[PDB]
Amino acid sequence: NKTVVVTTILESPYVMMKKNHEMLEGNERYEGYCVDLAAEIAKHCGFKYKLTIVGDGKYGARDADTKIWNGMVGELVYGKADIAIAPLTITLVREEVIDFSKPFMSLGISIMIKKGTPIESAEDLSKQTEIAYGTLDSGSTKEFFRRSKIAVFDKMWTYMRSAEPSVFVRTTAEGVARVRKSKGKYAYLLESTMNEYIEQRKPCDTMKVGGNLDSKGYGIATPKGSSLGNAVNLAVLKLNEQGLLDKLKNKWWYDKGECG
Amino acid sequence: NKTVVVTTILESPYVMMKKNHEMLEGNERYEGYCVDLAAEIAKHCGFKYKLTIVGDGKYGARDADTKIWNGMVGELVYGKADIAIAPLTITLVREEVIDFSKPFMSLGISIMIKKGTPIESAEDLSKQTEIAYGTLDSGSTKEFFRRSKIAVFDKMWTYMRSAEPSVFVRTTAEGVARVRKSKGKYAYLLESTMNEYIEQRKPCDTMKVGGNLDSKGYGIATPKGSSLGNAVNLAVLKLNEQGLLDKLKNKWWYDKGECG
Ligand SMILES: N[C@@H](Cn1ccc(=O)[nH]c1=O)C(=O)O
Ligand SMILES: N[C@@H](Cn1ccc(=O)[nH]c1=O)C(=O)O
Ligand SMILES: [Zn+2]
Ligand SMILES: [Zn+2]
């Protein structure tokens, strides 16, 4: 056996740098939901591993011109990593080039507003211009709007793609900061899981409104045909059935909430 | 190519017999969410099919003594059917003998009460005896309680397994009828999807209370190693991404609701 290389991404509260990480070594430098999940998966599958942060800090997309895959998906496709354990959305285009376990978390696209903003739904956003709105610049949320045939979402994409200045952000933290510093003039579309986490963090000035726009899940990914695929899938099902996944979400989202 | 044999189960609103089914033929005898889903999957995967109702009317369990699998799972394992398209829960023990697509629907175990019953949670049920409660006699809901290590659910299973008369029912319709005819002295534990459907059907005397006890999903199943597996999985992802699955749930659950 050989040490398994795990690729993941810095995204709270899935993977975060510990306070004195600069003086720590190996897997000890990180903490979070996916760090805990990686330890459980490795134990039940019988392997040793090394956590690494994706080089380009992206989730995974295919360049239309070069046909090259970037992000965590790219690291698996080109053999730079053996497995990805992160909040990676299961999608058709990705399933065609890598394998995914059954979902370890369920979620959907949602709306985040600065408290007091006069918006209650996607419909509301699409019918006005005073309040700007956008999504992560690369990922499944942006693709959802780009390819949607649904009236409201199609109208939203038409606005977002031409809006100036750009309404797209580089990271989740950037989107949250923009909502907080825009005095209610910017609303952010992001996955419900991240929205729910931020709502319980100081300065407690944001909130999730309306229902989710869709339904999907995050899965553990492996290179197509990997010998680890089968065991990892069974491990995810085992951990969910014994209540470990629910325990971990409570641990990183609510047990330590800062807003009451 | 050969006609694909689909096994499914009579469970509203997934698969139901049309009014004059006795005078109809083939796939035309049935209607419902899974009937519509089967047509879409077959079209996108390029195959012709024949719908059949599982012989023993069960979902799928393995006899501890004979080691024989029954229900829809059994039909796939022994080669009596080529694919199962029904509200079949993705579980570890089943994943070990058959293949599942990514989920086409997300759900969780829930509580159904006759309106007015003084119960608001699983905790409430576990701390009293006046109001009896049970689950489907065979399936993932019963297994959840049987194998749970969680205090409240463990206390609930201890009560249910010895309760007299039996608190377990043969079908969902039987459980609903018992709730309706017991004057509030029987509460039923069932999947949220079925609970949500019944709440919108006359005589509009039931309701779902509390949150779900767990989180899981339904998947399309095929015999392990089947050549249909890959295409069926991609088709489920395609249908979810284009909004067809959400449209179908609204069509069979809410568009025709009977309770306002
Ligand atoms: N999980 C996504 C990435 N991602 C993350 C947060 C968010 O709000 N939107 C999004 O697309 C993916 O896998 O691309
Ligand atoms: N989907 C289940 C069957 N099933 C259906 C309804 C319900 O309330 N509980 C249950 O276990 C399975 O696959 O066993
Ligand atoms: Zn463990
Ligand atoms: Zn279609």
CB pair distance less than 8 Å for B246 and A215:
yes
CB pair distance less than 8 Å for B92 and A237:
yes
Question: Given CB atoms, is B2 within the 8 Å cutoff of chain A?
Answer: no
Closest CA to B171 of B84, B77, B52, B54: B54
Secondary structure (H, E, C), chain B: CCCEEEEECCECCCEEECCCHHHCCHHHHEECHHHHHHHHHHHHHCCCEEEEECCCCCCCCECCCCCCECHHHHHHHCCCCCEECCCCECCHHHHCCEEECCCCEEECEEEEEECCCCCCCHHHHHCCCCCEEECECCCHHHHHHHHCCCHHHHHHHHHHHHCCCCCCECCHHHHHHHHHHCCCCEEEEEEHHHHHHHCCCCCCCEEEECCCCCCEEECCEEECCCCCHHHHHHHHHHHHHCCHHHHHHHHHHCCCCCCC
Taking the domains of chain A in order of start, what are their residue ranges? 2-107+217-256, 108-216
Say which ligand is closest to the CA of B240.
4
**Nearest CB to A103 within list B91, B92, B103:** B103
Distance, in Å, from the CA atom of A162 to the CA atom of A129, rounded to the nearest integer, reads: 13
Distance, in Å, from the CA atom of B104 to the CA atom of A215, rounded to the nearest integer, reads: 10
Q: Per DSSP, what are the bridge partners of residue A31?
A: A16
**Nearest CB to B92 within list A92, A234, A245:** A234
Query: In angstroms, what separates the C-alpha of A20 from chain B's closest C-alpha?
Result: 36
Q: Which CATH class is domain B2-107+217-256?
A: alpha beta
Other CB atoms closer than 10 Å to residue A230's CB: what's the count? Answer: 15
Reduced to 3 states, what is the DSSP secondary structure of residue A202? coil
Residue nearest to atom 14 of ligand 1 (CA): A139
Distance from the Cα of residue B94 to its chain's centroid: 15
Angle at A16 between CA A61 and CA A98, to 5 degrees: 30
Backbone φ and ψ for A189, nearest 5 degrees, come out as -95, 120
Distance, in Å, from the CA atom of A72 to the CA atom of A98, rounded to the nearest integer, reads: 11
Q: Does residue A87 have a known ligand-binding role?
A: yes
Reduced to 3 states, what is the DSSP secondary structure of residue A213? coil
Return the structure tokens found at A139. Answer: 């990922």
Q: Does residue A140 have a known ligand-binding role?
A: yes
Reduced to 3 states, what is the DSSP secondary structure of residue A159? helix
Size of interface A-B (CB pairs under 8 A): 70
Closest CA to B172 of B153, B143, B195: B195
Please indicate whether the domains covering B2-107+217-256 and B108-216 agree at the CATH topology level: yes
Q: Which CATH class is domain B108-216?
A: alpha beta
Determination technique for this entry: X-ray
Question: Given CB atoms, is B55 within the 8 Å cutoff of chain A?
Answer: no
Query: In angstroms, what separates the C-alpha of B181 from chain A's closest C-alpha?
Result: 33
Other CB atoms closer than 10 Å to residue B181's CB: what's the count? Answer: 10
Return the structure tokens found at B199. Answer: 């709440």
Query: In angstroms, what separates the C-alpha of B250 from chain A's closest C-alpha?
Result: 13
User: Amino acid identity, residue B142?
Assistant: K
